Symmetry: C2
Subunit: 550 residues, 2 copies
């Protein structure tokens, strides 16, 4: 579960996930996933091809060829001051000027970046990779950057979907990719206080796995948990599948330690809730690597749940589903996870008419699950909601960690797709869903796309004040002059539609450099000025120069 220094020995350098897990077309005509890693690994999927064909209007005859490894006569030169490097050596901090390690850490998982990895190359990439293995290591790195006017871009699991690790093309200084993956200890578990003191580089899978050994969990389960890190979550305000029980990352964090050019930020005590001015944890959460390096964090843990249980529900349409979820949030009896899929997604799940589907997960005490389960089904029964079965509800979840591998699959057959999200008020949810799908269909026809896009949505979280909505859109692009421009302009349009229908800039993807142009409207000008003024005091010479946000 620990990320090795040479990441490409385990992970795709040019796509999502593990090397040993990819979708392919099998000796016997159907699609299938290699390796043994997921419940779906090595399992044939009979009707998936037919679906893709009916959905995207392709026949799978047309395959694209992508770079299978790095073209090192297309990577730019590593410029690194020779004295700095002398000093670094004295420290014993593992580092690498290798094109591979460098190019691995130049991108996250935005479509644009995955396309360049496969087809082109980046303008700018890290110059040197460093592996601190503890707080003190990081202190030394930051002090070296001050002395040598270097620039540091921190990286954790590299799962950013906001251009948050892209290197600014015109950044002339030595760029360090400060890689946290070897700084990954559970320092200690505090069984009286129910917290774990961890280092920032630990992944979600590793964190849970280790804790499960003492009988604990965090329950923070972002879909990227296999690679995303504690330090990444804080930085991007991440959200997990069971936030309903465990909380989101702002709910989960009790304490943190942060290395800035100016010094170390940490509160003096481990109180659960204080009143000592604006909460500085919140100046750091969602700071997206622009401020300094998060080395340590204390996070709430919980005893492993007694029992869990899946379910699902059918609604006569999406709208009645939304109404039902709103009523669930109104009674404040959301189960561990509740997710409403529209019809297109329902039909997609089938391959592995206005009718929609919620999937459910319940966990906690055995007795409580069963009460909770009864309440939810009764409420839904009020909205045309009929139980669709406990096993159906397992399929939708078992499926979660393999959806991300299908984007790589779709790219092999000339289909470009991305998911993007927002949060919106309850009273805007239906209109936004309708108007955003429409907007994408339009922006697509007008840019010359043949078959109308695939355009789905799902309610993914519920809140007192509204919901988190996810969209997925994809279109086959064979014939389009500039495929990357069409998609990118359509994405940027669907954002405009989101903002105009009352939805927020991001629920959890964060901002990075993809959504920078809207930030100032999102918060006020003064709002934006205040962040600026924290940047400028913490990092006066802009050493943390990924240029996210501002």
């Amino acid at each position: 579960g620990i990320i090795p220094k040479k990441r490409q020995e385990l992970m795709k350098w040019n796509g999502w996930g593990y090397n040993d897990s990819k979708f392919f077309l099998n000796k016997k005509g159907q699609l299938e996933l290699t390796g043994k890693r997921y419940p779906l690994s090595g399992v044939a999927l009979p009707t998936f091809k037919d679906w893709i064909q009916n959905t995207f209007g392709i026949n799978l005859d047309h395959k694209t060829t992508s770079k299978a490894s790095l073209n090192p006569s297309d990577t730019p030169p590593s410029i690194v001051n020779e004295d700095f490097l002398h000093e670094l050596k004295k420290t014993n901090i593992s580092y690498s000027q290798e094109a591979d390690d460098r190019v691995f850490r130049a991108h996250g998982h935005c479509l644009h970046e995955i396309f360049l990895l496969r087809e082109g190359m980046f303008e700018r990439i890290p110059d040197i990779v460093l592996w601190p293995t503890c707080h003190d290591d990081v202190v030394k790195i930051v002090n070296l950057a001050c002395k040598y006017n270097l620039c540091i871009i921190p990286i954790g699991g590299g799962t950013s979907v906001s251009y948050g690790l892209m290197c600014p093309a015109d950044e002339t200084r030595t760029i360090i990719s400060l890689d946290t993956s070897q700084m990954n200890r559970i320092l200690w578990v505090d069984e009286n206080n129910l917290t774990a003191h961890v280092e920032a580089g630990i992944t979600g899978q590793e964190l849970e796995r280790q804790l499960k050994e003492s009988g604990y969990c965090t329950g923070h389960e972002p879909d990227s948990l296999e690679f995303s890190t504690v330090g990444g979550w804080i930085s991007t305000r991440a959200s997990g599948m069971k936030k309903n029980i465990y909380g989101n990352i702002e709910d989960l964090v009790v304490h943190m330690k942060v290395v800035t050019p100016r010094g170390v930020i940490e509160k003096s005590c481990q109180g659960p809730r204080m009143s000592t001015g604006p909460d500085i944890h919140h100046f750091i959460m969602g700071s997206e690597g622009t401020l300094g390096v998060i080395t340590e964090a204390t996070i709430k843990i919980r005893p492993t749940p007694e029992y869990q249980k899946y379910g699902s529900v059918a609604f006569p349409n999406f709208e009645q589903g939304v109404a039902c979820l709103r009523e669930i949030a109104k009674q404040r009896c959301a189960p561990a996870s509740i997710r409403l899929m529209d019809n297109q997604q329902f039909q997609f799940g089938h391959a592995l008419n206005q009718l929609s589907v919620a999937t459910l997960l319940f966990e906690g005490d055995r007795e409580k699950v069963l009460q909770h389960e009864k309440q939810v089904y009764d409420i839904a029964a009020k909205f045309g909601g009929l139980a669709a079965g406990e096993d159906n509800g397992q399929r939708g979840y078992l499926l979660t960690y393999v959806i991300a591998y299908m984007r790589d699959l779709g790219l092999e057959y000339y289909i470009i797709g991305e998911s993007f999200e927002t949060s919106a008020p309850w009273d805007r949810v239906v209109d936004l869903c309708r108007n955003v799908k429409e907007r994408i269909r339009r922006e697509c026809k007008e840019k010359g796309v043949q078959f109308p896009p695939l355009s789905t949505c799902r309610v993914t979280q519920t809140y007192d004040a509204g919901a988190c909505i996810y969209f997925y859109f994809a279109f086959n692009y064979r014939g389009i002059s500039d495929p990357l421009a069409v998609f990118e302009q359509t994405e940027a349009a669907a954002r405009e539609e989101i903002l105009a229908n009352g939805g927020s800039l991001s629920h959890h993807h964060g901002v990075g450099k993809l959504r920078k142009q809207w930030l100032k409207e999102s918060i006020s000008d003064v709002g934006f000025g205040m962040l600026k003024s924290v940047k400028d005091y913490v990092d006066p010479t802009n050493i943390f120069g990924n240029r996210n946000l501002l």
Copy 2:
């Protein structure tokens, strides 16, 4: 329910709360609460005077003499006054209006109100009624170089309202009590759009008319305002169900010298950079004026039910509270009091060890079915710790009391009894030691400073969280024949704050910082931490219009 421009028509100028509500010795020789505003109003408290005598060793034979209502003149630029005239915004240069808004409710202030005087008091009180009104005032204060000190309920317990002695600029008191509308209720999204001046009492009373509540109930809800809450990171009695302020606020609008802070949307939860709501929450009047907020509302609870539990000692009670927090089944309110609080609460009434036992009071609210289940789980857990139910009316008694405690301080003042309370939050594994060490420290400091009778030195756990608990301490003593009673109080308080910190507890859980705990802030938040806040202060308020000097 709205606070009137002349506050002294309803409220004590020289102490807590309403004019018509004070303790007094009755025809029958028993202490009683005047008026009929609280359940306990007009009820005779038979054993109370004995408890006071036995605790502090007084007769009640001689009561102190307060001042009965010194005051620097009101100097104010004329071109400014002329322009203020034009806005039609009400204002006052009257000494008594200005003197009302120069303090909140820290012992030191209330004492200075009775005996001495404030070295500095605001120079002019203004009353905006709306957002625009505040924009104008702020624009003026920048133009004419005037300091602004916002005030809502005046219930600060941190010196957050005190005017800095050496501030030579004209100080405006920007009173928000007349900007108090529920702009509107959003029945679908379950939120309310409201002005910052609305009090807790008014907000709940109004919302109740539509079948809604916020459930945000600080002990000062009668006077404390939306604006103050956000400013001080307030916390209420039922935050277990309803959340604390930071959970309750969905949006806000802040007028600052630099301009208006405001998020563009009303979404439940976002990832758009560091959350700016959090730059403002806890800002204690140092950055601008919160004019409007959107707060979550909830349907009126269908059912409310009290209860109480008795434990063989305090440690056992703490352990139970920790287990209750471990199974995440805290009722709407749960509060564990130490033995002294039990005996105290006993003396105020209308086989374990009675000098050992501690008592938890409980409030349960929600759907009647849910309430009953919760209630069973809770008494099951307590029973494992030696816990036995002591009845709903005891529980009922516990809660209603909370609103009269603040009138009792005024009582003790007039019989040479200075007292105050202070809070902290700590991790679960420090609670027991922190309680013991802080009480013990308070006694030793008083013995050493030459107090005759040993001080009242109680504690209670007042909120539970996953990671810890909120702890209240209360301390009081007879000060007849002490040279410098204030200096003795304020030293002790400072010592006990050092103990709290040396035992693992925070600067404050909800009191906030103001100017009373400024000297620990930098170490509480890192040096860089403190520097971060200064940068925000300097950007937003370059010319330090908002000059209460809280925090930094």
